[PDB]
Symmetry: D2
Subunit: 462 residues, 4 copies
């Protein structure tokens, strides 16, 4: 057992635990979801605390003896050796003060334990006077988040660049596959499966550029802003030195905002990212819809493609294999949509020099980024790479179609092409047959026209 002085009374803390009274209070105040902050935020908090201790020792504001152990402690945190000590809820009041304190108390007691001391003795190492030195809950929390979101964002970018490329391999793999293009779900003119699959790769790439670009306004941190961001009593040399430590230790081109009051009360950089991730899932969701449509059947559906099986199929029903992968892609799209509304709401709920709604906002931003990376990973591996086509099925879909007339029209004139089209539609005979029966094009003269490639690309009539 143990006991720590809290204005709300003396509380007991497990002798094995590293969090202090403050964290417990947070646990009692906001027991909402039961979730634990993402390990990357934890890692980033470690980085933020380590970089601050350092700068503080350099400007000489932190005793070099204590601030020496604090570092090795923050490093252990960074290495992910204390993700269980962070028990506060992602959704909490206090605009993040509890997330800051949970880290301050864990880094403080470990630092105390490390230099042979009593964990609870905040006189030797104060999580609030040493660990949280030269920093406020309004600059440490956001900075750690910017770092977390940035690290996380890069991981998504690469997982999407991979997916996007695998989408191209399929575009070429099917670059010769001919089929029927549908507009309004109504049969139109011929199109190549590869043209649709490249279409997918192109929107995805466009998604990568947009997501990637949201990182810029995320690179500006407000470390050094005091409470309101006016830097009251803040050492300009601390700011310059800590900013650089964060950058090197976080591997990000971090920068110090030109205006701290602005970088303190505004949250537009967070929404910018959510908005990009939303646009990405909008597209991915649509692509996931086309995938389920082309996979429909096998008998009473479109049956254009075949997705690998990922979940056992009913025995009495051979052929029924649900596109479970593309489906889970649709659901993540919906989640991201929902998170973007939650994020939108938190952002505008900001008041004056501080937006206290940041905690629920960050929980969603980081969630979206996470779940997207994960579905992308498994969706491409467990579905995309192994997509096969039913060329034959689609080939004939083009034969029994009417739209194919557009290709033929130029070689027969509108007058006859229309007659051929109408009749074939009413009687049910392929347009190919009507050209021979009515004698207007020979079997050979027809294939030289029904050229899959030349038929799906712009060009003269010859």
């Amino acid at each position: 057992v143990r006991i720590e002085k809290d204005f709300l009374g003396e509380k007991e803390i497990p002798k094995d635990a590293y969090y202090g009274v403050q964290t417990i209070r947070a646990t009692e105040n906001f027991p909402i979801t039961g979730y634990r902050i993402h390990p990357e935020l934890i890692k980033s908090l470690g980085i933020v605390k380590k970089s601050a201790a350092l700068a503080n020792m350099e400007v000489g504001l932190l005793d070099k003896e204590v601030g020496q152990y604090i570092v090795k402690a923050a490093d252990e945190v960074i290495e992910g050796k204390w993700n269980d000590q962070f028990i506060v809820d992602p959704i909490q009041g206090g605009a993040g003060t509890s997330i800051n304190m949970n880290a301050n108390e864990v880094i403080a007691n470990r630092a105390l334990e490390l230099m042979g001391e009593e964990k609870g003795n905040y006189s030797k190492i104060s999580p609030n006077s040493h660990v949280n030195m030269s920093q406020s809950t309004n600059d440490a929390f956001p900075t750690a988040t910017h770092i977390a979101v940035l690290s996380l964002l890069n991981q998504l970018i690469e997982t999407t660049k991979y997916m996007q490329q695998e989408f191209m391999k399929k575009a070429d793999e099917f670059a010769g596959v001919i089929k029927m293009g549908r507009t309004h779900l109504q049969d139109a003119v011929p199109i190549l499966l590869g043209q649709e699959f490249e279409a997918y790769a192109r929107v995805i790439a466009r998604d990568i550029e947009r997501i990637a670009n949201t990182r810029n306004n995320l690179y500006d941190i407000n470390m050094g802003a005091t409470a309101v961001g006016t830097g009251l009593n803040a050492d300009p040399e601390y700011i310059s030195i800590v900013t650089e430590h964060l950058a090197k230790f976080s591997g990000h081109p971090l920068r110090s905002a030109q205006h701290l009051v602005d970088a303190t009360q505004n949250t537009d950089c967070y929404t910018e990212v959510s908005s990009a991730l939303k646009v990405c899932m909008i597209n991915m969701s649509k692509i996931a819809n086309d995938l389920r449509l082309m996979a429909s059947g096998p008998r009473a559906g479109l049956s254009e493609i075949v997705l690998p099986a990922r979940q056992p199929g009913s025995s009495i029903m051979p052929g029924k294999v649900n596109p479970v992968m593309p489906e889970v892609m649709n659901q993540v799209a919906f989640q991201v949509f929902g998170n973007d509304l939650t994020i939108t709401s938190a952002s505008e709920a900001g008041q004056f020099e501080l937006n206290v709604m940041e905690p629920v906002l960050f929980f969603n931003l980081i969630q979206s980024i996470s779940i997207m990376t994960n579905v992308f990973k498994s969706f491409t591996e467990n579905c995309l790479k192994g997509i096969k086509a039913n060329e034959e099925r689609m080939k004939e879909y083009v034969e029994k179609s009417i739209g194919i007339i557009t290709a033929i029209n130029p070689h027969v004139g509108y007058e006859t092409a229309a007659k051929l089209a109408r009749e074939a539609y009413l009687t049910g005979e392929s347009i190919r047959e009507l050209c021979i029966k009515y004698g207007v094009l020979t079997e050979e003269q027809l294939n030289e026209i029904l050229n899959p490639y030349e038929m799906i690309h712009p060009g003269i009539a010859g």
Copy 2:
């Protein structure tokens, strides 16, 4: 021309115009959408002003000689003889005052004309002191909306009940049209077309319930709440009398809110209505998606049903008949989804004794009730009623499906059920033509098993 002085300066009001400086200034401050308030809101304003004029005269607050004219004028506003005079932007600040004043000025001036006086002579009939006597923007405006929304609501209910019944007709009409059910867009077991249509009729019936029941909370008005909702200086006999007058002329069971303060600051009833509309449109959209899918084709799609052609088909390409009506349905569903977010947002933005964001809220709420009633009518008349079925196409779907085997299993043992199926899965041989060309059930017997009704209904295995 005419000149009306304003604390902002002199504005030249058109000679033939019935509005005044108040209305003009509003046009200047809020040139947002350029739209006009729904004529049902205009009519409602006329009722509110009339019900107030009579009450004020009965309680001796308003000169019966002037009041008499005001009532006659308000009566013309109720008959929609002056909708042109209402020019303020549905989206405006001031929490509705511009809208209220537009009605106060128009009625005030039209009244002066009736009693042979110069329009704009607010000394005889002040729009503020006479037409707006004993009321506040905070109670007149919201009460008008309560009446308008209720009226539009009842219409939506009629048009929806009509539509719901037309769905039932289709359910009966197709009560025997067998087709192939799908789950995950994957072939499943057989199902009756008419069953899907009753599935729609039911959810819609259920919408009618939810929507209609949201009327109750609107019945409570806050007329006579004055500014905050304290009724400060308001005469209980005025309230009593005015509430009774509103119910009588509006046609709704209006009730004077038990807690006028609660009724003056809470907007939970509007979010309740929007909630019910959004849900309805969700159902309606899923249904439209189904329709466009069942109409896809002809050659390369489902082709289960035929929707009546409204848009002229491809000039010379037959067969392509886009499902425009179900499409315009889907879009309205999207509008209502966005409208509900606007409403949610405007509702939560409330502060203390008054939610000043009501105009955008009411504008969206009314718009939903309006556009929904409008497509519901157009969709049932120009699509729903004329939907025809491709009985044969769906018939063969059930026949050549490797899934109808679930309906035959009990009669041929779970052993022979794997051979007659898994074989029909490769050779593609009809599951029926296989029973014959193998021996297990005689044709006349095989039809009592694959019967359209008992095959799509609950029954003991064998």
Copy 3:
């Protein structure tokens, strides 16, 4: 170690684990959030499985020896003795098939272990042939959910009835507290703190009725619907018997849907609930905003009320105590908003006889219900019950105000009341002083007018 036959190969399962190959596959296919389904869904799955085993034994479809142990196993599940065996992700493809199987395999192996057998021997007890007998993933999953959502919903209703009542105790506690009502955030006329607090209780109560009422369409289950809901090969006696078991064991007035195809493909009942919960948080969020405004200060803010302290305050800043509780209330409101968009999207993404987007939809519905219950619990305990008022502070706010003139106006006429009001506004002297200086009302004659109660309620001028 162990090993189970899966079409995707032979997989290893920890000898201690109760889930089988299928669950593992689910774990590999959809590793999205890392979350575990809510223990109540687990409990409900238990109930659903237990009730099915029973009915199956009664209709004699399940061997009474095996189905005997399965029950005691499902009961152990119901008692929450295996919430760790359910490892699948809330967000999964397959419209919930994996959640069904995770329960089927855990209930199967425990049942096997219980009758002294080998867990992996699906020949003795098949999670797919015994446990999942007379049921499909399209009727068991939703039913368990309806039951889960219903149980959960009641808990919220009571936690809100409590909060709502505590809101009234404060209404009366402050029934005498006078203050300044604000519309547009601009000073208006006087109002009682108790009138605002009752206003809160009234919207909340209205929230309880709406939330409570959403339970009705949730009472209809579709147990007995086969795959598509046509009940193909389903024993009508099984349906009647299982439905009743569910009802008694779940404590809910469960009913068997009149139309199973409808109850299978429609999801409108889920959105109905989300929509009610959304409306509730809209209101709660607004109430939480007023609370933060009234708590503002202590020096440069409104300072109307004082919320108990829940998180340590800056030492150099005595008086600064952030409304962390009302803030976490605002964030949950945003979450629920987001979940309602995710829920809306999943509902309309339904296709034909089955909506496969139900998993992400249920994850949100259950989350919303949960987090709301939790914030409600702690918000009332850690904030609501202990709200104190600064009567003095507010009393004078009414003295230095102008709006107070409205109360006085009747006893002095518009001519003089306006002069008194203007001057006091320009010079800065209270209206009370101007009445004595200008001699128009004596100190006594003024207090008999500035009666807090008579001033905040409708009435004549005498």
Copy 4:
């Protein structure tokens, strides 16, 4: 009158009317909102039709004698001389065909009039075969939108840059107005007014960036994609020429999409624009909330600033000046939030080679760009420019605050800082009048410490 035959029957087109059966039928099928397409879309349609007419003539596809007239007519449509003739509902099915045909008919008939022919004589000038020659609804409509949105976008940018600069002016103008910062709406440390205004100017500057950069993806048009996007039968010289004509007359750096299929089915660029607008409005709304708060009062509120009166204040109650402009700002922000959900939803509803839900999407997108530009102008001209400050009120706020002590701590030791503060917390004695009436810093010295600039800026403790 006039009679025009339609596959639906004979419709009597008005004699003075320039539209035809196509347009009329659309009015019948879609009587949804009753609105008219934004005149910028109309103008764009005229440009597209002109750029196509010239290209078709150059490549010899269109009779130069007829084409000549078509161009002149399209030229009148570009000059907005016929906006009245465009009567189709912005919300329509058919994926834009009605809108496209409305432009094809109007231009076709106005051309026939110019060359002395009977209007409706589509044998001379067929709206479908001449005005719509070499194009498809699928490429004409989206390209027009690309041009319209781009044009409106550039205007929004001008008006926003203007507004952003006006904010800067206020930032400079108040560069020295000290006030009391707030976080959690709780008193904090001092901050400069002008700092909050530059905080706004910066986020808005940042919006200008994000918004403008979304123009790039719109630059790529798909003109000449025909139905699906295969360009089947389209002449590369036509495309080349038409794209160049569009850029020239539109004024934008239009580029012919590299993958016409990708450009014909993806809508990710519109969601990208809406995303940027939504974010901007989030910032703008937070700012409006701040404004209404800083204008609250006068007597019972913050009263930090004075907004110019636009709505006539309480007839006889002085002091009450509602912040209507910031309010109408908040509402527009809510509209754009809903519009973004509609757009998100319409975007994801895409299918295969065409997203048929574009009309509702474009309607909302354009509406956002329009209403935003409109309030941005009105708000800066009727509010922002005339914002005055209550320098004294804010001055005393800083003076009587128990928080200014953080700015004096370094000079009086962390020991005397607890006595001079915690005492001023109860007696309410000025933190300054306490330093004097206690001895620690001389008046002339106490002012170099509590200086408005160095007190709100980063600096070494002492």
